[PDB]
Design a protein around this nucleic acid. Structure first.
Ligand SMILES: [Mg+2]
Ligand SMILES: [Mg+2]
Ligand SMILES: [Mg+2]
Ligand SMILES: [Mg+2]
Ligand SMILES: [Mg+2]
Ligand SMILES: [Mg+2]
Ligand SMILES: [Mg+2]
Ligand SMILES: [Mg+2]
Ligand SMILES: [Mg+2]
Ligand SMILES: [Mg+2]
Ligand SMILES: [Mg+2]
Ligand SMILES: [Mg+2]
Lengths: 87, 217, 144, 185
RNA sequence: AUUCGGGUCUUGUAAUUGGAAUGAGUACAAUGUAAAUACCUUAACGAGGAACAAUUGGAGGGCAAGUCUGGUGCCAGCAGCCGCGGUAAUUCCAGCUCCAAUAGCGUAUAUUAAAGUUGUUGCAGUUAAAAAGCUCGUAGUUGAACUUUGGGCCCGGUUGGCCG
RNA sequence: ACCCACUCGGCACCUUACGAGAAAUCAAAGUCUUUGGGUUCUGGGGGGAGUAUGGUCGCAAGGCUGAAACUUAAAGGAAUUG
């Protein structure tokens, strides 16, 4: 969000949910962020590098949080043969 | 003085969180009003209403006080709180504590064109509470705040300049009115407008960059 | 479908329905039935002269007992009897009988549990003098 | 059978009558500028409002449309001649942002006190209605003259007036006659 | 400021003072005007203004404004609505004060807004007013999908840039 | 006949709410100020009153259609404490 001088003028660009592309808002205490650990060849996880996801409180309440996480991870290289695109 | 009891409080008192914008971005649940105090220094309260309430406790009749209190920056932050205590100044005190706690951002934007600072709202919003609905509509600049006294105060203390309202229901119950209005401004940051489509990279929580800090002894 | 026809060639049904439905409004019914010209004591005018028929000591009980110092007035244009309040006057030394009296409207709702009724008129003038001016000792009353 | 002489109201009474905030705002506004009715304020609020309407009605139409161009530019340059709108704000979106004081600051009343021909604002009132204060070759005796910008640099005392020049007033030569006759005696 | 005093400013006053200003009104003249009246002009007068004296409604709430004195309380909780007591009343009556709009302000009737309490935009219908006992059925309102898409060429306009 | 899996169509129940609602509650009473899928009917404070009058249907008892003057500050819903 800009004005004419080309400068941004918001309080903050907010976090969007990853499953649902909807906005997570500030009072949503059911929303969540998931850090998954990047791993070495030696099977050690580095202390400070994460693949992170966002989830709206809506999706966790509705009980789709899991399946959503699955698909997301699987597509982002974490898993394989857990989540099918067909059912 | 003040001793934090929450791993969000020790983060604050150790100046590891500058603005609230970092609380709000990650939705980190506030429970220590002092947080809001330090992060929002220029927060100006306002008792909207004070009401004698008749308690009947085990055949012992007492008189207490219900207080509806609003707080806010005249930039982008509001807060609303209701509290009942045994003494008036006590009620007001506690009320301000509560409203401090439930402080919310606001997306204020433009009407049509795009000059100077954002003056009005970004989109039409609507809050409902009780039987009351309150609807807020973008005005053009200099249209002032078109609302009844209560809702007008709540919006002024939230740095809105120009906004048309439309209410409905028994607006005479000021607590439902205020609550509803509150909801309606508290929805602005929740309406996905096209200028927010661009994908961001997920930020890493203050709670994890400063995790060694503000950890319980 | 919100129970009303919403079709593009449906106007007639809509507006007709509206006409049949406006008869539940109160004022509309008063206004197309000419209730004002047929029944209302004033005949649809903001005022009426009348002549005081009888000085009334009505007594209206609950919740507050008015020693109702009111009047029976008969309107000149209708020959229609009416009751009317005569304000601000403790003794009623101002209004006697056979006196010409200009009346206006007055909105006192009557109450049930004490049998207090609702007069609808207040004396504005007596014998051509304003009730107020008399009461202010500003003007005096020609007594005939 | 004439033509019917057209005419119009000028102001508009507020919607909520007792509103402790508006009450005060109004009073301080009357105070800065020495007005006598709230009505004087209302008159301004009303002209303002008609301008804000013309403004919006132009704003909702397309840029580079003949009408918005024409009436836009007109409204703008009109607002500028009286120096209500500043030289740099020459675009519609500011004429909306305009407020009351921006109008209240161009009164002859005001400009007399801000060109320092008066000691206080009230003094400026009196001095105006007293037929003292001219704008160029004209006297003007209305506190609401609304000074155009090219007429700012002309306001002075009246060539008729005691201060402007001429002979002393009636009181002055009264006391001149009193002292001269009391000394001749 | 160490203390007297060096001055800036703004106030409360004092039916304190001082000298300025001026049109309300009066009036030669002229202007105006068919003739006049007036306006606009203008000699000559014309206030400390202890009276060139401003009102109309209010002061429990709605709704701006009383934590003020006496009287009441036999002409007394009382009259848009709701409140509220009686030796001691902010709620009645009188004075004082204050508030609002002001050469105007109140009141009555009508009407529009408020009223999303007429609802096309826009109401409601389980229990608050309101789904016909039930189906059939003409006018009426309403009515699935589908029939040149897609591609290639050229022409000249009106805003916007980077050069002027 | 039964048992398991599935499937249209019923029928009630039990959970919840994303949603609605004044609340009780509701798979509709949801997709409703972010207000428009088609259509029928009805209501506009409480009384006066389903009364008076007219018309119509019925052998009658009655039904259908259905006011006004006047009156009144509430009548009413749901929930909560004792
Ligand atoms: Mg309403
Ligand atoms: Mg002549
Ligand atoms: Mg008075
Ligand atoms: Mg009162
Ligand atoms: Mg009041
Ligand atoms: Mg008050
Ligand atoms: Mg309704
Ligand atoms: Mg019932
Ligand atoms: Mg019912
Ligand atoms: Mg049925
Ligand atoms: Mg078709
Ligand atoms: Mg009815």
């Amino acid at each position: 969000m800009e004005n004419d001088k080309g400068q941004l003028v918001e309080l903050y660009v907010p976090r969007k949910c990853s499953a649902t592309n909807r906005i997570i808002k500030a009072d949503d205490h059911a929303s969540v962020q998931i850090n998954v650990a990047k791993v070495d060849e030696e099977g050690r996880a580095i202390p400070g590098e994460y693949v992170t996801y966002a989830l709206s409180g809506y999706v966790r309440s509705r009980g789709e949080s899991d399946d959503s996480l699955n698909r997301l991870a699987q597509n982002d290289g974490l898993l394989k043969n857990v989540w099918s695109y067909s059912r | 003085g003040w001793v934090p009891v929450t791993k969000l409080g020790r983060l604050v008192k150790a100046g590891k969180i500058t603005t609230i914008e970092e609380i709000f971005l990650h939705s980190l649940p506030v429970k220590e009003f002092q947080i809001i105090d330090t992060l929002l220094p220029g927060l100006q309260d306002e008792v909207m209403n004070i009401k004698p309430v008749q308690k009947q406790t085990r055949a012992g009749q007492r008189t207490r006080f219900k207080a509806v209190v609003v707080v806010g920056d005249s930039n982008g932050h509001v807060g609303l709180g209701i509290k009942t205590a045994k003494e008036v100044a006590g009620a007001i005190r506690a009320g301000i504590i509560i409203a401090k706690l439930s402080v919310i951002p606001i997306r204020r934007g433009y009407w049509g064109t795009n000059l100077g600072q954002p003056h009005s709202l970004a989109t039409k919003t609507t809050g409902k509470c009780g039987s009351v609905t309150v609807r807020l509509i973008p005005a053009p600049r200099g249209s002032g705040i078109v609302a009844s006294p209560a809702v007008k105060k709540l919006l002024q203390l939230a740095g809105v300049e120009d906004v048309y309202t439309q209410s409905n229901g028994k607006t005479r119950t000021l607590e439902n009115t205020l609550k509803a209005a509150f909801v309606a401004i508290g929805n602005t940051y929740g309406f996905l407008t096209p200028n927010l489509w661009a994908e961001q990279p997920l930020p890493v929580s203050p709670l994890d960059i400063y995790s060694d800090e503000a950890s319980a002894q | 479908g919100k129970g009303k026809p919403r079709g593009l060639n449906s106007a007639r049904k809509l507006r007709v329905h509206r006409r049949n439905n406006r008869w539940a409004e109160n004022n509309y019914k008063k206004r197309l039935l000419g209730t004002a010209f047929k029944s209302s004591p004033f005949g649809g005018s903001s005022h009426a002269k009348g002549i005081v028929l009888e000085k009334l000591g009505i007594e209206s009980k609950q919740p507050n007992s008015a020693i109702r110092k009111c009047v029976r007035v008969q309107l000149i244009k209708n020959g229609k009897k009416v009751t009317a309040f005569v304000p601000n006057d403790g003794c009623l030394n101002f209004v006697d009988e056979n006196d010409e009296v200009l009346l206006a409207g007055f909105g006192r709702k009557g109450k049930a549990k004490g049998d207090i009724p609702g007069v609808r008129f207040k004396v504005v003038k007596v014998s051509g003098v304003s009730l107020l001016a008399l009461w202010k000792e500003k003007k005096e009353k020609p007594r005939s | 059978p004439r033509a019917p002489r057209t005419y119009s109201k000028t102001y508009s009474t507020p919607k909520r009558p007792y509103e402790s905030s508006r009450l005060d705002a109004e009073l301080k506004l009357a105070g800065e500028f020495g007005l006598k009715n709230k009505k004087e304020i209302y008159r301004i609020s009303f002209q303002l409002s008609k301008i804000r309407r013309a403004a919006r009605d132009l704003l909702t139409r397309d840029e580079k449309d003949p009408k918005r161009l024409f009436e836009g530019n007109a409204l703008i340059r009109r607002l500028v001649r009286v120096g209500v709108l500043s030289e740099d704000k020459k675009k519609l979106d500011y004429v909306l942002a305009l407020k009351v004081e921006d109008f209240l600051e161009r009164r002859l009343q005001t400009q007399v006190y801000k060109l320092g021909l008066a000691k206080s604002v009230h003094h400026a009132r009196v001095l105006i209605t007293q037929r003292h204060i001219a704008v160029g070759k004209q006297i003007v005796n209305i506190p609401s003259f609304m000074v155009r910008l090219d007429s700012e640099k002309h306001i002075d005392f009246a060539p008729t007036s005691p201060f402007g020049g001429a002979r002393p007033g009636r009181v002055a030569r009264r006391n001149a006659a009193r002292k001269a006759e009391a000394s001749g005696e």
